[PDB]
Write an enzyme that holds these catalytic residues in place. Structure first.
Site, PDB file in Angstrom:
ATOM      1  N   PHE A  21      27.027  24.930 -30.180  1.00  0.00           N
ATOM      2  CA  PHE A  21      28.071  25.929 -29.946  1.00  0.00           C
ATOM      3  C   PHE A  21      29.394  25.304 -29.500  1.00  0.00           C
ATOM      4  O   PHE A  21      30.442  25.956 -29.599  1.00  0.00           O
ATOM      5  CB  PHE A  21      27.601  26.898 -28.835  1.00  0.00           C
ATOM      6  CG  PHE A  21      27.066  28.228 -29.311  1.00  0.00           C
ATOM      7  CD1 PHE A  21      25.740  28.362 -29.711  1.00  0.00           C
ATOM      8  CD2 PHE A  21      27.881  29.355 -29.338  1.00  0.00           C
ATOM      9  CE1 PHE A  21      25.244  29.595 -30.155  1.00  0.00           C
ATOM     10  CE2 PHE A  21      27.383  30.589 -29.777  1.00  0.00           C
ATOM     11  CZ  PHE A  21      26.068  30.700 -30.183  1.00  0.00           C
ATOM     12  N   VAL A  24      32.598  18.498 -27.041  1.00  0.00           N
ATOM     13  CA  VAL A  24      32.872  17.985 -25.690  1.00  0.00           C
ATOM     14  C   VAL A  24      33.897  16.882 -25.841  1.00  0.00           C
ATOM     15  O   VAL A  24      33.697  15.957 -26.628  1.00  0.00           O
ATOM     16  CB  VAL A  24      31.628  17.540 -24.882  1.00  0.00           C
ATOM     17  CG1 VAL A  24      32.027  16.846 -23.575  1.00  0.00           C
ATOM     18  CG2 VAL A  24      30.697  18.719 -24.598  1.00  0.00           C
ATOM     19  N   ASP A 127      16.252  26.920 -19.924  1.00  0.00           N
ATOM     20  CA  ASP A 127      16.345  25.910 -20.983  1.00  0.00           C
ATOM     21  C   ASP A 127      16.291  24.505 -20.381  1.00  0.00           C
ATOM     22  O   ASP A 127      17.066  23.614 -20.733  1.00  0.00           O
ATOM     23  CB  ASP A 127      17.621  26.143 -21.834  1.00  0.00           C
ATOM     24  CG  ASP A 127      17.643  25.384 -23.161  1.00  0.00           C
ATOM     25  OD1 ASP A 127      16.562  24.920 -23.605  1.00  0.00           O
ATOM     26  OD2 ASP A 127      18.733  25.257 -23.748  1.00  0.00           O
TER      27      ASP A 127
HETATM   28  C1  LIG Z   1      32.371   4.799 -22.567  1.00  0.00           C
HETATM   29  N1  LIG Z   1      31.562   5.845 -21.963  1.00  0.00           N
HETATM   30  C2  LIG Z   1      31.028   6.706 -23.038  1.00  0.00           C
HETATM   31  C3  LIG Z   1      30.197   7.859 -22.408  1.00  0.00           C
HETATM   32  N2  LIG Z   1      31.018   8.631 -21.457  1.00  0.00           N
HETATM   33  C4  LIG Z   1      30.700   9.970 -21.092  1.00  0.00           C
HETATM   34  C5  LIG Z   1      29.829  10.808 -21.850  1.00  0.00           C
HETATM   35  C6  LIG Z   1      29.572  12.122 -21.394  1.00  0.00           C
HETATM   36  C7  LIG Z   1      30.187  12.643 -20.224  1.00  0.00           C
HETATM   37  N3  LIG Z   1      29.930  13.976 -19.822  1.00  0.00           N
HETATM   38  C8  LIG Z   1      29.482  15.013 -20.605  1.00  0.00           C
HETATM   39  C9  LIG Z   1      29.360  16.108 -19.779  1.00  0.00           C
HETATM   40  C10 LIG Z   1      28.888  17.467 -20.096  1.00  0.00           C
HETATM   41  C11 LIG Z   1      28.954  18.455 -19.069  1.00  0.00           C
HETATM   42  C12 LIG Z   1      28.495  19.746 -19.330  1.00  0.00           C
HETATM   43  N4  LIG Z   1      27.918  20.083 -20.498  1.00  0.00           N
HETATM   44  C13 LIG Z   1      27.843  19.164 -21.485  1.00  0.00           C
HETATM   45  C14 LIG Z   1      28.269  17.817 -21.333  1.00  0.00           C
HETATM   46  O1  LIG Z   1      28.144  16.837 -22.308  1.00  0.00           O
HETATM   47  C15 LIG Z   1      27.218  16.984 -23.397  1.00  0.00           C
HETATM   48  C16 LIG Z   1      26.987  15.601 -24.025  1.00  0.00           C
HETATM   49  C17 LIG Z   1      26.150  15.780 -25.326  1.00  0.00           C
HETATM   50  C18 LIG Z   1      25.766  14.422 -25.964  1.00  0.00           C
HETATM   51  N5  LIG Z   1      25.178  13.481 -24.994  1.00  0.00           N
HETATM   52  C19 LIG Z   1      25.978  13.262 -23.777  1.00  0.00           C
HETATM   53  C20 LIG Z   1      26.277  14.608 -23.069  1.00  0.00           C
HETATM   54  C21 LIG Z   1      29.840  15.670 -18.509  1.00  0.00           C
HETATM   55  N6  LIG Z   1      30.190  14.392 -18.558  1.00  0.00           N
HETATM   56  C22 LIG Z   1      31.048  11.819 -19.468  1.00  0.00           C
HETATM   57  C23 LIG Z   1      31.300  10.509 -19.918  1.00  0.00           C
HETATM   58  C24 LIG Z   1      31.675   7.797 -20.433  1.00  0.00           C
HETATM   59  C25 LIG Z   1      32.426   6.601 -21.046  1.00  0.00           C
END
Ligand SMILES: CN1CCN(c2ccc(-n3cc(-c4ccncc4OCC4CCNCC4)cn3)cc2)CC1
EC number: 2.7.11.1
Length: 308
Positions: A21, A24, A127
């Site tokens: 949906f 990010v 979930d």
């Molecule tokens: C270089 N290096 C790369 C990785 N990088 C990073 C990656 C992810 C995030 N981050 C994502 C969320 C978030 C919050 C609420 N709902 C969904 C969310 O994400 C969904 C994704 C779906 C795919 N898998 C990861 C999570 C919060 N922080 C912060 C930093 C930092 C820097």
């Protein structure tokens, strides 16, 4: 002009790979320099978004990914959230193959803390799965995706799949049992390439017990993974369960350490230099928690201070 308002407050970084949906995008908050994650939903491609926003405005906890700011245009909804750079718990388990009982307990007590608090606030997540738990910069877990919450088949309780009446809290305890198994095994207790054969396996409730599981781990799994939801352990009894207490000797601290009422004097002072309010007016405005740029600035300054 879908990004105009957002660009007044944030400097956009890259879009990270997702599925569903929402997109990010990573970003940094201009005023504080703090990194954030921004969940972006295209309006014409809605209820799930509104349910998640309402829940996150009411939930505030050390193991829940924090909502800082909600922005809306005619085409998009933006949710500015707590930065969790340590990745999904799902990817962490795979990288380790499986976690030892000790490391599973470290991680699992954090999940229990978050979920017990969610139930204490009148909600059920519905979930729970390792893709919905992210690690922050301090290697602490943060629960995400409250879009299906109430006031994924492999993790779903048998009654939930069957479309029967259920209590969200009991469905969460079942999903936590699946999570406990995956943490200690590195694979699902019920798994099949065919959806119908997986449905059959879940309803039967029978699973392999690998040789590396301790008797205490097996007993806790039996108490959570009960097909009859009335036979499942209560969240209250999970807080001080013997397996949970092993090597700790104190129940899980589920109460939130992140307040709505108390304001940090240093953060109110830092924030006030950007506004034209007397101190009482500034504190009263922050205390409204509108999830506007003011909320975001205050909570990000609190995150900045916490880093030390
Ligand atoms: C270089 N290096 C790369 C990785 N990088 C990073 C990656 C992810 C995030 N981050 C994502 C969320 C978030 C919050 C609420 N709902 C969904 C969310 O994400 C969904 C994704 C779906 C795919 N898998 C990861 C999570 C919060 N922080 C912060 C930093 C930092 C820097």
């Amino acid at each position: 002009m879908d990004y105009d308002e957002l660009l007044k407050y944030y400097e956009l970084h890259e879009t990270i790979g997702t599925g569903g949906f929402a997109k990010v995008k990573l970003a940094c908050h201009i005023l504080t320099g703090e990194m954030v994650a921004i969940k972006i939903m295209d309006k014409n491609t809605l209820p799930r978004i509104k349910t998640e926003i309402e829940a996150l405005k009411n939930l505030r906890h050390q193991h829940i990914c924090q909502l800082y700011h909600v922005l809306e245009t005619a085409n998009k909804i933006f949710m500015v959230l707590e930065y969790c750079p340590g990745g999904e718990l799902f990817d962490y388990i795979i990288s380790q193959d499986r976690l030892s009982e000790e490391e599973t307990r470290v991680v699992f007590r954090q999940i229990v803390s978050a979920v017990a608090y969610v139930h204490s606030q009148g909600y059920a997540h519905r979930d729970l799965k390792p893709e919905n738990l992210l690690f922050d910069e301090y290697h602490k877990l943060k629960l995400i995706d409250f879009g299906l919450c109430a006031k994924s088949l492999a993790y779903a309780a048998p009654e939930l799949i069957q479309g029967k009446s259920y209590l969200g809290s009991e469905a969460d305890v079942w999903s936590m049992g699946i999570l406990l198994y995956v943490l200690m095994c590195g694979f699902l207790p019920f798994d099949d390439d065919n959806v119908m054969a997986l449905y059959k396996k879940i309803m039967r409730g029978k699973y392999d017990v690998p040789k590396w599981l301790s008797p205490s781990s097996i007993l806790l799994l039996q108490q959570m993974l009960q097909v009859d939801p009335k036979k499942r352990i209560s969240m209250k009894n999970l807080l001080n369960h013997p397996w949970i207490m092993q090597d700790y000797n104190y129940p899980v601290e589920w109460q939130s350490k992140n307040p709505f009422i108390h304001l940090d004097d240093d953060c109110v002072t830092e924030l006030s230099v950007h506004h034209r309010n007397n101190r009482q007016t500034m504190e009263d405005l922050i205390s409204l928690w509108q999830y506007d740029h003011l909320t975001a600035t205050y909570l990000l300054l609190l995150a900045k201070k916490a880093r030390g």
